Amino acid sequence: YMCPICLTKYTQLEAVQLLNFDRTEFLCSLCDEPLVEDDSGKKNKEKQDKLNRLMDQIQPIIDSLKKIDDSRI
Amino acid sequence: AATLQLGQEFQLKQINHQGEEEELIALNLSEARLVIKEALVERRRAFKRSQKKTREKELESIDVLLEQTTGGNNKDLKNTMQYLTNFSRFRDQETVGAVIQLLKSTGLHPFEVAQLGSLACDTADEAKTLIPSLNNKISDDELERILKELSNLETLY
Amino acid sequence: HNQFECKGCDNKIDIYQIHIPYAAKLLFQELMAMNITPRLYTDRSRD
Amino acid sequence: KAIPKDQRATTPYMTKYERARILGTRALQISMNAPVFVDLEGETDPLRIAMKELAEKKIPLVIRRYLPDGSFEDWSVEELIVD
Amino acid sequence: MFFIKDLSLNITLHPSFFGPRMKQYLKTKLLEEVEGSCTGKFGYILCVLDYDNIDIQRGRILPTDGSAEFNVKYRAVVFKPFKGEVVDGTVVSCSQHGFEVQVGPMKVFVTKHLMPQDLTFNAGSNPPSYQSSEDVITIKSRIRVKIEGCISQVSSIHAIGSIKEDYLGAI
Amino acid sequence: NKDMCPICKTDRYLSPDVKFLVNPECYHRICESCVDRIFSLGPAQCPYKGCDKILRKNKFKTQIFDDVEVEKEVDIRKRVFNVFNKTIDDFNGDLVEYNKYLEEVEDIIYKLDHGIDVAKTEEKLRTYEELNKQLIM
Amino acid sequence: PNLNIVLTCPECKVYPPKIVERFSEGDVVCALCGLVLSDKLVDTRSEWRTFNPLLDGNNLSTRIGKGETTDMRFTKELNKAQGKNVMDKKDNEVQAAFAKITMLCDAAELPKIVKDCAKEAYKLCHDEKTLKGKSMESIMA
Amino acid sequence: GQQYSSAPLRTVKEVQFGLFSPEEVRAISVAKIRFPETMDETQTRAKIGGLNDPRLGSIDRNLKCQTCQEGMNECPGHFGHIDLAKPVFHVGFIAKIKKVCECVCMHCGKLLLDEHNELMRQALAIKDSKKRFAAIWTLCKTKMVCETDVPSRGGCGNTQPTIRKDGLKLVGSWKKPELRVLSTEEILNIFKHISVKDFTSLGFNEVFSRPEWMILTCLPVPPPPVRPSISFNESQRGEDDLTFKLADILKANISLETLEHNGAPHHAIEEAESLLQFHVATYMDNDIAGQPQALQKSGRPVKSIRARLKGKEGRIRGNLMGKRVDFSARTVISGDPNLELDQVGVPKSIAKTLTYPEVVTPYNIDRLTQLVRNGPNEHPGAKYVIRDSGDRIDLRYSKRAGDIQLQYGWKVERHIMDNDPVLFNRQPSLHKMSMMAHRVKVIPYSTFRLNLSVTSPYNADFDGDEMNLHVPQSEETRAELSQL
Amino acid sequence: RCSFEETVEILFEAGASAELDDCRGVSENVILGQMAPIGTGAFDVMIDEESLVK
Ligand SMILES: [Mg+2]
Ligand SMILES: [Zn+2]
Ligand SMILES: [Zn+2]
Ligand SMILES: [Zn+2]
Ligand SMILES: [Zn+2]
Ligand SMILES: [Zn+2]
């Protein structure tokens, strides 16, 4: 999680530590402010992009690298 | 963690205040409810000695009578004691006493053998999935045979 | 909040509080700024 | 550590630093309404009460004297001699 | 998890208490201020047992403020969570992200995002609780959780559990 | 696909230490790296485009002969020769019948094994559930 | 965050409070009950007693030269290492403006206050489409 | 005050020195310092990631240090870091690097002549460290070849250059004479390839000082309190030198980061970083001989860190070994043939100021109640009441409250009064009789009066000599005075 | 040692040599602002127990 008002990220265990019987949702001791999740869309979306970039080397060098590994001269 | 990595304070090699090593003490989830009562009472005779100069109904009075003997902030200790009764799965120490007789040939790490006692375990696939260190210690035969005793040994109310 | 944490050791348990002259706490913080670590330990190891 | 009472070798007298530190803490304690083991015959100054207890050997403290190695003997002010 | 443990303590007896019966206030202070306390290192100190033979060896007067201080060693019982072993307890409270489960003295929190996906919160429970096809997990419902997290800021513990697998969820 | 994870395509060239596992639910080629990450949390879908078979890391296993047709049949046989271990050929002895009972068990197995139209196999699975009772009976 | 501190007597609370700073004691006190709110006040004239951001801003500076204990094979390179980052800064045209106008108003026999307003009046406009060069005199003029 | 905390209070028993691993810096650091700007780019609060971001400690007695909270008088300031573009020498160790390099093959990292030498068998004897490295460096500093085996051994076979310091630079020459000045990265890389057993023997400690830590890679940025700004007249919020040198470091770093990302004249670079190496050097110590003084825009030198500790007035001599103190007074002395040998006459005007916090007990509560009625001004009075809760109250500005109720265990800061012991001292004070404890007697006009006999120990006379008075603030330091 | 003559160069060697400085000197204790084991500080004051019978 993260409080944008402080612009600072937090994680689950902080949240449950920061949670309350009254506030079933999270405040922000720095900001006294409700938090927002994070890393959900961007990173998943990000890594798949590099996966193709990682794929971009598959038929390229790494295959031809193994084509060097046949003899390794 | 799960892999039987408890804290250095709780390392299998424990020490008492007189220094010699001893077994780590881990408790089945209701005889711990028993030793507590023993203590609270043993204080209830004692706190009152210096002061001189189903069960579900009675447990509360049993509890709360001992409560005044203690520091009163401890219905949160009762929060376990209440739990410890609600989720009690024994009585009558020899119940455990025989069960503890029964278990403690296990050849198993105490967090396990206490966990097996503590746990309402019907299946023997249970352990190898519930207590995943318990997949190749004792097989379902020696497991469930005890569990099958445990089922009857689950003395209910 | 009653929470302490030496990150960099990820410790939140083994903490102590000490009274020292501020001009010492300065001095340490200037031995650090020159990359000297004056670690302070509250019990003896050489014995 | 803990030289046994029959082997205590240090002086049986009270060093003047022991006397000064004893009367300090004792007076400090009295000034915190610690109970008083003597009849304050009109006295109201915590240091002067302390000098009175000490003269009656009624201070319930004990001196832990460290040797240079690290071990220590223990004397109770009631048994040390004052000059 | 429960244990019985040999622990030590340092308590400062303020100078007023230095009468003949100081030892009494020591034990009194002990139970009154060690029982029912969470510590990040040991857990919830529950029962000070062996109330007779507690080691109370010898006190030192701190130089300023002239208060005695004692190092008392004793034996007691403690609920200590971990990560990766199944624990049972009835829910008490609840939220939108999950429901707090009161186990021992620790109100564990199990969050659905760790529990099996088939029970997404059917928020329609009053009192709030989760209704799944296999079972409906209510406030005082019995639940068997494995603990998949913990935190120990000193004098506090919050843990994390899940019931995603078999033998889990409701009881 | 021969030596790289169908999920992350980490080649055995690029991760020689890659260890492939599949599950009896679907028998999917995959590296352990995904395996743990996928089911370190708990029972969910297989990380395959087109697999919504909810499965669990304890059920995971290691292929031996890479023949997911034999291995499943081997598993089918393993499932059979566990309960259908209650088959009687030596316990039967009649050379034709011991042939037949084996043929019968194998036909029951082949029904599960051939798997082309495995619903008589499901009927045999009922018979296998009956075998779970017949290996009990 | 708001990172802000305010003092108020928690035993009067009546106001945005009536407190006074007893400097010579290093205290602030509720002017009603005399509870001291906060102490160890830090001095306020001795600070600059021991001793231009309106122009020189945040990119700071420090005159670097040669000490007694340096030979010319290290001194002149301090004159040859200082010269690598004079164009990332337009500040030559910032300072050499001031230096120029300082050279001007001073040679013009002017009060040193005008020098500042011109050290300002450059710095405030200092680049505009209206300016767009225009000989860089007329402004300094 | 100071707020109650819970961590158990201990006392320091041991200091373990030792260098700083660049990983450790980063693990400590709360902030990556990047922009030389101090303030926010809008002439307002402060540039985050700037030279004092709020996550470092804060001052203004008005903010909260958003890392660890509020009090400018609780936050000890939290450390931030800078990671240099390329590694540089730490001035304190150039000599202890040049020396070291002359004791290890500059190619494989192994030591030069080892225990198979006889005197190495004689060197590694020494139980002392700083001489082991000394005696070893006598043997190894003159051999020049990474030998391979001399049985009665490591190899690497290379000739070992000769080295000389020249203003923050180590230039090595072989013979094969390659007078190529040595990069740091080689040395850094060299060092990272030395046996634990070697540098251990060499005199280091693999937990607290790897030799490869004498080369700075990351940089720890002290929080503001180490280098506070003088917020003066709303625009002369002047800045400490250490802020400047840090800016000047950060710039000279910021530049050199580009000059590799954007082209490489490969001699401008060789100077560019050798510039930054100069800034870091003079930051630690701007007093280095064989180098140019790094001056200020006043043309005065820059107060290096080393300068802050050097002589008197440094931290050690002038702030730790001795310091200025509260509860003291100083005035001219006079004689008095009518005071006892141990009294001192204290001007009423001074006794009204110095003060002694007494604890309310049954034995004085009424008497202390009286003083609090006299209040601050009339003499036998008092100036503050301290509530057991650590709370303090000015007696002026409490006439509004008027009557005050004392309770046991409260503390009253009364004036000093006759017979209080005070410590009296006459400087220079070069023997223990120059500080004796006297008993107050409060008298009129403003000199200290002392008996005449006491004058020869203090070595005083009455031609304007002044003597200092120190009041003990506790019940137990009092008895230290009266009894010792 | 650092408090006498050449404060920093001494402090560097210590930091290089990972000197462990055990704080038994008066001068070390002064810097930490502790009670030096000196004179009245050269022993501890323990609270007697048996004598607390009365
Ligand atoms: Mg004179
Ligand atoms: Zn926030
Ligand atoms: Zn994969
Ligand atoms: Zn007020
Ligand atoms: Zn802070
Ligand atoms: Zn070599």
UniProtKB/Swiss-Prot annotation, chain G:
<feature type="binding site">
    <location>
        <position position="30"/>
    </location>
    <ligand>
        <name>Zn(2+)</name>
    </ligand>
</feature>
<comment type="subunit">
    <text>Associates with TFIID-IIA (DA complex) to form TFIID-IIA-IIB (DAB-complex) which is then recognized by polymerase II.</text>
</comment>
<comment type="function">
    <text>General factor that plays a major role in the activation of eukaryotic genes transcribed by RNA polymerase II.</text>
</comment>
<feature type="zinc finger region" description="TFIIB-type">
    <location>
        <begin position="5"/>
        <end position="38"/>
    </location>
</feature>
<feature type="binding site">
    <location>
        <position position="33"/>
    </location>
    <ligand>
        <name>Zn(2+)</name>
    </ligand>
</feature>
<feature type="binding site">
    <location>
        <position position="12"/>
    </location>
    <ligand>
        <name>Zn(2+)</name>
    </ligand>
</feature>
<comment type="similarity">
    <text>Belongs to the TFIIB family.</text>
</comment>
<feature type="binding site">
    <location>
        <position position="9"/>
    </location>
    <ligand>
        <name>Zn(2+)</name>
    </ligand>
</feature>
<protein>
    <recommendedName>
        <fullName>Transcription initiation factor IIB</fullName>
    </recommendedName>
</protein>
